[PDB]
């Protein structure tokens, strides 16, 4: 597929969101799903369009599989590649670290010559601080199954429509 989606998950939510995103794009012919736990950093080189999914755990920390491959990211060819991001978080229980993991990954990957695409509005959420927020907007899709599960389906629909316009679809 032209789009490679790499996700990490601890309690399965980010994987379910990833599957939904793949479905919304049109399925396997359009988006390849890859669990970062079973990947080598070089696997990301096979795609020119990437989607990076990761939930936040601990206190604003990267999900363990992403944490484990983080130091290898600088060896990947991200030069001129368009990269989108999504994450699962809990804005009520972790208002000061909402979606910090997505922010950490974008901050690292965007510093490696890539182009972040898929910015998302912060207005549909209530939180205090987030490393995923730059210039008053999220660096990618923020999903909250703990507090806003009813909004997930339409958020994904909206975001994917937005991304197609930015991914050549
Ligand atoms: C112990 C614990 C720590 C968490 N830490 C954070 C955090 O710092 N920020 C946040 O946005 N959500 C945090 N969450 C919420 C998770 O990101 C959320 O439940 C998400 O759906 C988990 O996704 P996953 O199932 O893909 O692992 C935490 C939840 C728990 C139970």
Swiss-Prot record:
<keyword id="KW-0249">Electron transport</keyword>
<dbReference type="InterPro" id="IPR001226">
    <property type="entry name" value="Flavodoxin_CS"/>
</dbReference>
<protein>
    <recommendedName>
        <fullName>Flavodoxin</fullName>
    </recommendedName>
</protein>
<keyword id="KW-0288">FMN</keyword>
<dbReference type="InterPro" id="IPR050619">
    <property type="entry name" value="Flavodoxin"/>
</dbReference>
<keyword id="KW-0285">Flavoprotein</keyword>
<dbReference type="InterPro" id="IPR029039">
    <property type="entry name" value="Flavoprotein-like_sf"/>
</dbReference>
<dbReference type="Pfam" id="PF00258">
    <property type="entry name" value="Flavodoxin_1"/>
</dbReference>
<dbReference type="InterPro" id="IPR010086">
    <property type="entry name" value="Flavodoxin_lc"/>
</dbReference>
<dbReference type="GO" id="GO:0010181">
    <property type="term" value="F:FMN binding"/>
</dbReference>
<comment type="similarity">
    <text>Belongs to the flavodoxin family.</text>
</comment>
<dbReference type="GO" id="GO:0009055">
    <property type="term" value="F:electron transfer activity"/>
</dbReference>
<comment type="function">
    <text>Low-potential electron donor to a number of redox enzymes.</text>
</comment>
<keyword id="KW-0813">Transport</keyword>
<keyword id="KW-0346">Stress response</keyword>
<dbReference type="InterPro" id="IPR008254">
    <property type="entry name" value="Flavodoxin/NO_synth"/>
</dbReference>
<feature type="domain" description="Flavodoxin-like">
    <location>
        <begin position="3"/>
        <end position="164"/>
    </location>
</feature>
């Amino acid at each position: 597929a032209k789009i490679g989606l790499f996700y990490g998950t601890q309690t399965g939510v980010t994987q379910t969101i990833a599957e939904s995103i793949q479905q919304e794009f049109g399925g396997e012919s359009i988006v390849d799903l890859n669990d970062i736990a079973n990947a080598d950093a070089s696997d990301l080189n096979a795609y020119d369009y990437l989607i990076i999914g990761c939930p936040t755990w601990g206190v604003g920390e990267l999900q363990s599989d992403w944490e484990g491959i983080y130091d290898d990211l600088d060896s990947v060819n991200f030069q001129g590649k368009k990269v989108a991001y999504f994450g699962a978080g809990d804005q009520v229980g972790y208002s000061d670290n909402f979606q910090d993991a997505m922010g950490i990954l974008e901050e690292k990957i965007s510093s490696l010559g890539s182009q972040t695409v898929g910015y998302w509005p912060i207005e549909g959420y209530d939180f205090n601080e987030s490393k995923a927020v730059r210039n008053n907007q999220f660096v990618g899709l923020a999903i909250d199954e703990d507090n806003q599960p009813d909004l997930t389906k339409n958020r994904i629909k909206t975001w994917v429509s937005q991304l197609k316009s930015e991914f050549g679809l």
